[PDB]
Amino acid sequence: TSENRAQVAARQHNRKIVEQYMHTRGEARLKRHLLFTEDGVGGLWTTDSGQPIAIRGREKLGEHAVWSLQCFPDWVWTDIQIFETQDPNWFWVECRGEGAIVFPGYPRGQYRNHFLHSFRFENGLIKEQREFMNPCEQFRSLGIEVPEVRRDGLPS
Amino acid sequence: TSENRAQVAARQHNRKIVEQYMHTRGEARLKRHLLFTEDGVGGLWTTDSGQPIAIRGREKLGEHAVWSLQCFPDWVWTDIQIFETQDPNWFWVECRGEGAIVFPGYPRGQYRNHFLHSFRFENGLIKEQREFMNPCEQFRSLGIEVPEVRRDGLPS
Ligand SMILES: O=C(c1cccc(O)c1)c1c(-c2ccc(O)cc2)sc2cc(O)ccc12
Numbered sequence: 001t002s003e004n005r006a007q008v009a010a011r012q013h014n015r016k017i018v019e020q021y022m023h024t025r026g027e028a029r030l031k032r033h034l035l036f037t038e039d040g041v042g043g044l045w046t047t048d049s050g051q052p053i054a055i056r057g058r059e060k061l062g063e064h065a066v067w068s069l070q071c072f073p074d075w076v077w078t079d080i081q082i083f084e085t086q087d088p089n090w091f092w093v094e095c096r097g098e099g100a101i102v103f104p105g106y107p108r109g110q111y112r113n114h115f116l117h118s119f120r121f122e123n124g125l126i127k128e129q130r131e132f133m134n135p136c137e138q139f140r141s142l143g144i145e146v147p148e149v150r151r152d153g154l155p156s
Numbered sequence: 157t158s159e160n161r162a163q164v165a166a167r168q169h170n171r172k173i174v175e176q177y178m179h180t181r182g183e184a185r186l187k188r189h190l191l192f193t194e195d196g197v198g199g200l201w202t203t204d205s206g207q208p209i210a211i212r213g214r215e216k217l218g219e220h221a222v223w224s225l226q227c228f229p230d231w232v233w234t235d236i237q238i239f240e241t242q243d244p245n246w247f248w249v250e251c252r253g254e255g256a257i258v259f260p261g262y263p264r265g266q267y268r269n270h271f272l273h274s275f276r277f278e279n280g281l282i283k284e285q286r287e288f289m290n291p292c293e294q295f296r297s298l299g300i301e302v303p304e305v306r307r308d309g310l311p312s
Pocket residue numbers: 043044046047048049053067068135138305307310311312
């Protein structure tokens with residue numbers, strides 16, 4: 001059907017955008033915001049406070065990349081697995097990430113973590129990117145003590 | 157093609173299993189392990205230590221459900237969104253979960269969180285289930301202090 005053709009076409013184009021995003025590194029990160037719609041949103045959905053840190057708007061995304069290039073100067077996404085879905089405009093990615101972390105007021109460290117990303121598209125560009133990770137590993141990379149759930153009472 | 161028919165059939169059956177898993181509640185949780193292969197694995201991939209808590213084998217999954225029915229006595233998954241993928245044997249689920257948490261040696265609490273699940277299938281049953289969440293919300297539900305990354309030096 002004409003609908004299936006349109007959905008197939010959208011999914012193939014959108015997959016190329018996800019691939020490009022995931023392989024953007026170095027100075028090219030300063031232009032990654034051009035993969036978003038003008039009102040596109042990106043950011044980190046898993047933080048210590050329980051609220052997302054959402055960067056709203058293509059312009060603010062480009063401004064944020066200037067910061068992230070300083071505080072994550074050599075970040076790489078690795079082990080990238082891209083998942084298309086029944087929605088041609090919705091993709092998920094499982095990957096790892098790694099790089100130096102140079103966060104204001106903390107010792108320089110090395111950060112490694114597992115990540116899941118969600119990518120939702122509109123008219124050929126990213127409308128919403130969300131990443132999900134375990135913040136405990138970011139705490140460790142910053143030298144912040146991670147609390148330990150006591151396991152004495154739990155099954156082996 | 158015959159391959160596409162086989163993949164389409166697998167995906168439709170597997171989706172019904174994911175739906176059944178996500179809607180299993182109450183005493184029916186004691187039989188949820190029958191949705192797994194004999195060597196199937198399930199568990200929690202995001203914890204304070206950074207290592208998964210994997211429950212290995214259909215038999216051990218059924219034993220674990222006895223524990224989880226005591227310590228999460230009224231758990232419900234809500235806001236369930238099931239994502240098929242290009243792999244007919246791989247699904248992702250975005251959802252929320254909620255219920256009392258009655259963990260050994262901690263005050264009884266109420267736990268709410270956002271979750272992602274991965275479901276991989278073999279021969280019509282779950283070979284690997286993995287959940288991913290932000291442990292900071294589980295800490296809060298247990299009365300454990302969550303450290304705060306200092307944000308003074310960060311862009312507004
Ligand atoms: O790393 C990040 C982060 C968040 C969004 C985008 C990004 O590129 C990095 C964290 C925070 C952060 C907040 C505002 C900001 O302008 C830069 C950074 S605050 C915080 C608290 C945590 O517990 C864990 C992570 C972060």
